[PDB]
Every structure is written in C-alpha cells, then in structure tokens.
C-alpha cells in the first residue's frame, strides 16, 4: 500500500522512448541513492546518470555546455538558490506545470519554471562531550552571550560567506531579517570563529572537539550525521529560523524532457518527499510529510510556523548577486568577524 506520483501517462510513454535521464545535483549521491533506486523501481526503463557536483560547478558546466551548444543535463537540482533562479529567470528552464505541485506554496515556485524540493533550517550543532544542551542557547542573543566566555575562544565554526554560495545566502538572510545577528557576528569575532566553505570540514572539527559549536549549517546534514555520530547535538533557534530550499528545474534543451518531468514530479510527490525525509533526512518542502525532517517537526521545534523565514524561489533573491547589496553585508561581516 504505496502511492505513485501523478505523472501524465503520455509523459511516462515519452520517457520510455527517451530511456535516459541526466541529472546535475548538489545532493550527495549517497543521500539521493534511495530516491534514485525508488524512481527506477517505478520506471525501470530509465537509465540515470547522476552527477554529484558542487553548486558553482553545476552552474558553470550547465551554462558552458549550453553556450557551446553541447548536450547538457535534463534536470538541475541545486541548493544555490540564486544561481538556480538566475538560470530560470534567463530562459534556461522548460516551462512545465508539475501535477504534483498543485498545492505548492507561493514562496516555493517560480511560475512553471523552478520548484522548491526542500525546506531546510539553519540550526546550531554542538559536541555533547563539551557542551551540555542546557549550555547551548537557542537565540542569537544567547549565543552572543555564550561566545563572550574565554573558554569558547577558537571553539566556534560558521560559514565563510565569501567562499560558499550557500553560506552567503543563509548568513545574508540572517543579517537582513534578524537585528540580533549583528551582535552575534561581533561575538564571532570575539570568539575567533573559524569559517568554512565545507559543512563536512566544519563538522569534522566539531566532532573532534577542536570546535564545540557550529552556527548556520543545515538541519538536514546534522540529522543525517546523527545516524552515525552519537556526540553531535542539534539546537533549533527559537528567536527565528532561516530556511533554504533546494531548487529543481528542467533544462529547456533537455534531450530527455519527459524523463526529467517524471523525476521532478517524483521529487515533489508525497512518495518522493516522504522517502527523502525518511532516508536522506533532507527536510521536506511538502507540508503533510510526517517525521523529524518535515515542516511540521520544524515548526514544533522553533515554536511555530511564523518563526520560520523561507528564502523564496523568486527573482527577488537575485538582489544578492548585485555587488551593491553584497557589499553592505560583507563590509559589516569582515569588520565584525575579523
């Protein structure tokens, strides 16, 4: 007793003829594997080429291949929201109204061009051998107070927003939405915060104890690592949570557009959103999913849906690519943290 995605039978038959699907994705293949296996159970006639790539790498390969008239991906799935919206904003995406997106929220799609697949909170993580939960504040002001402690000097990690597309988006959204972020950033400076472009490199120092606490990394990644890392703790912010959305679109110039429609539909479905939340611990976008990596669990943890600010799948976020907008944030950031 399972659902299938509500893909049009004619799209299924055109996909059967294509026989192939090429994905460029920022989602770790180990994370996506159960999704890929389940999709191939539904559609065994589709061979998948899954290209696990960094966000900038995805954008550069896609626009370079397109520019040269080389064949490129059928489907782009990336946590770099502004780069994905920029490509859809510029006519790279195939217009497609997914039958699985009828109730997709407004801040979760750019018309019939690009869709959110996830709703992923920026959280606090910590090493349980060095900080007890009672020592870990759940507000920006609390964290700024913790980072005044001499013993927290050198013991904090966060993003380097100058070397991560995704770290920029999260910390810029924080800076734009929460006044208390400015007091927290100065505290990063006091505490000699180390800045990472890799969530993995940041978590390695937290796990080893070189840092005790990390700010601004994805709840999805933290829950996944908890499956095997028993010392990693998660604290959800109760004064306001920024959430990012992994955006998918179909290449207008896809060789296999109908296979890509099936895969998009699959990702937005009840079936695909549940499997993603259950297997990958990637926080779902779909509001009805049940489990820890879901909007309902997240709203409960932060004290309500009104405490979550979803970065929207909208051309408004292209202001983050304007140097004038970047500079006000980055000037404050460089000063506060060094």
Cβ at position 327, least distance to Cl ion in Å: 27
165 or 336: whose CB is closer to Cl ion?
165
| Adjacent-strand bridge partners of 7 | none
Minimum distance from residue 281 beta carbon to Cl ion (Å): 13
Q: Which of 273, 330, 327, 256 is nearest to 104 (CA)?
A: 273
Is residue 28 part of an annotated ligand binding site?
Answer: yes
- Give the nearer residue to Cl ion in terms of CB position, either 271 or 286: 286
| Nearest residue relative to Cl ion (C-beta) | 200
Nearer Cβ to Cl ion (142/233): 233
Binding footprint of Cl ion on the chain (CB under 5 A): 96-97, 198-200, 233-234, 286-287
Give min distance, CB of 164 to Cl ion, in A: 10
The CB-of-323 to Cl ion minimum distance in angstroms stands at 27
Query: Are 274 and 284 contacting, i.e. CB atoms less than 8 angstroms apart?
Result: yes
Q: Of 279 and 296, which has the nearer Cβ to Cl ion?
A: 296
Of residues 23 and 284, the one with the C-beta less far from Cl ion = 284
6 or 180: whose CB is closer to Cl ion? Answer: 6
CB of 9 to Cl ion, least distance (A): 15
Q: How far is the CB of 257 from Cl ion (least distance, A)?
A: 11
Return the number of the residue (156 or 289) whose C-beta is nearest Cl ion: 289
Please write down the HEC assignment for all residues of the chain. Answer: CCCCCCCCHHHHHHHHHHCEEEEEECCCHHHHHHHHHHHHHHCCCCEEEEEECCHHHHHHHHHHHHHHCCCCCCEEEECCHHHHHHHHHCCCECCCCCHHHCCCCHHHEECCCEEECECEEEEEEEECCCCCHHHCCCCHHHHHHHCCCHHHCCCEEEECCCCCHHHHHHHHHHHHHCCHHHHHHHHHHHCCCEEECCHHHHHHHHHHCCCCEEEEEEHHHHHHHHCCCCCEEEECCCCCEEEECCEEEEECCCCCHHHHHHHHHHHHCHHHHHHHHHHHCCCECCCCCCCCCCHHHHHHHHCCHHHEEECCCCHHHHHHHCHHHHHHHHHHHHHHHC
CB of 161 to Cl ion, least distance (A): 16
- Give how far Cα 54 sits from Cα of 16, 40, 80, 286, Å: 30, 24, 9, 25
Known binding residues for Mg(2+): 26, 28
Known binding residues: 26, 28
């Amino acid at each position: 007793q399972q659902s299938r995605p509500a893909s049009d039978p004619q799209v299924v038959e055109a996909a059967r003829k294509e026989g192939r699907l090429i994905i460029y994705s920022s989602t770790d293949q180990s994370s996506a594997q159960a999704l890929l296996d389940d999709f191939r159970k539904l559609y065994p006639f589709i061979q998948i080429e899954y290209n696990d790539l960094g966000t900038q790498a995805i954008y550069d390969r896609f626009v370079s291949e397109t520019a040269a008239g080389a064949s490129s991906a059928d489907l782009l799935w990336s946590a770099a929201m502004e780069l994905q919206v920029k490509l859809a904003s510029e006519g790279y995406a195939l217009p497609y109204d997914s039958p699985e997106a009828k109730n997709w929220p407004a801040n979760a799609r750019l018309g019939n061009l690009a869709y959110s697949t996830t709703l992923e909170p920026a959280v606090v993580v910590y090493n349980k051998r060095f900080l007890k939960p009672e020592e870990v504040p759940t507000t920006r002001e609390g964290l700024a107070r913790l980072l005044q402690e001499p013993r927290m000097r050198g013991r904090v990690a966060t993003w380097d927003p100058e070397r991560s597309a995704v770290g920029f988006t999260i910390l810029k959204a924080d800076y734009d939405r929460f006044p208390a972020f400015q007091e927290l950033a100065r505290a990063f400076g006091k505490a000699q915060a180390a800045l990472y472009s890799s969530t993995g490199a940041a978590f390695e120092k937290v796990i080893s104890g070189e840092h005790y606490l990390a700010y601004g990394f994805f709840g999805s990644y933290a829950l996944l690592r908890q499956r095997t890392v028993k010392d990693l703790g998660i604290a959800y912010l109760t004064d306001g949570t920024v959430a990012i959305q992994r955006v998918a679109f179909i290449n207008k110039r896809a060789a296999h557009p109908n296979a890509a429609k099936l895969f998009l539909d699959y990702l937005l479905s009840l079936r695909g959103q549940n499997l993603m939340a259950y297997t990958a611990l990637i926080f779902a976008r779909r509001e009805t999913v049940v489990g820890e990596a879901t909007p309902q669990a997240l709203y409960k943890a932060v004290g309500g849906k009104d405490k979550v600010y979803a970065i929207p799948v909208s051309t408004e976020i292209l202001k983050n690519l304007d140097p004038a907008e970047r500079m006000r944030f980055l000037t404050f950031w460089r000063q506060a943290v060094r």
